[PDB]
Amino acid sequence: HLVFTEFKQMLLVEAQKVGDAVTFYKSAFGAIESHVLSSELNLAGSSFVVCDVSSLPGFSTAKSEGSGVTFLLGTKDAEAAVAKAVDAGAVKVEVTEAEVELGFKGKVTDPFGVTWIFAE
Amino acid sequence: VFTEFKQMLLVEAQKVGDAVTFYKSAFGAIESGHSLHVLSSELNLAGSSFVVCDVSSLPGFSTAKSEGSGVTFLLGTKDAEAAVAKAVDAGAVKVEVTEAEVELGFKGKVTDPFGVTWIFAE
DSSP states (O other): OOOOEEEEEEEEEEETOOOHHHHHHHHOOEEEEEEOOEEEEEEEEEEEEEEEEGSSSSSSOTTTTTTOOOEEEEOHHHHHHHHHHHHHHHOOOOOOHHHHHHHHHHHEEOTTTEEEEEOO | OOSSSEEEEEEEETTHHHHHHHHHHHHHOEEEEEOOOEEEEEETTTTEEEEEEGGGGSSSSOOOTTTOOEEEEEESOOOHHHHHHHHHTTEEOOOOOOOHHHHHTOEEEETTSSOEEEEOOO
């Protein structure tokens, strides 16, 4: 019986970006914060960890130009969520008819190459 | 206010089952529910969870698997080499860790069949 003492999802960022990142996440979503340079951020009662890729030996880049990093957020107002994020630097992506069928009413990409879709 | 925050792992068309089966085998993930081939499945693991979903159901997105995705997870465990072999038997590929990677304590590393990099702490 092998067990794991914890499971975290690591959002890699380019060199010296962990700070621009929290900065952007604290703003666009209201995330709450908390060798390897990293910062744990909290949204909806769960967390992720933004990590500086240059501070993780073994890795070469954050793949920010084409990462498959995708998060889902639930809220009561997806339009107001997109607009808040865009005023903070995110780019609104039109939600396909398809995404609207799964209730995914809003969607944006951020400066770190992550894709966030709002599920209402 | 946000009421849920869930990572979405994008995988190859028709492969959500191979992933649901794989994640259970390698890590003992738990399927807390799914939606029908499988369109998506949320997996519980070590107190958290991630959702797996066939990209063919989400046009515009890209798994980024052929060019390396940045999907990275950390899993703390008592025996890293054991978890590495346990994951390799399910189809993952072992990545040797160097001394530089030792100072931090991550004595194992694999990239699963879905392009995810899993670091093991110990």
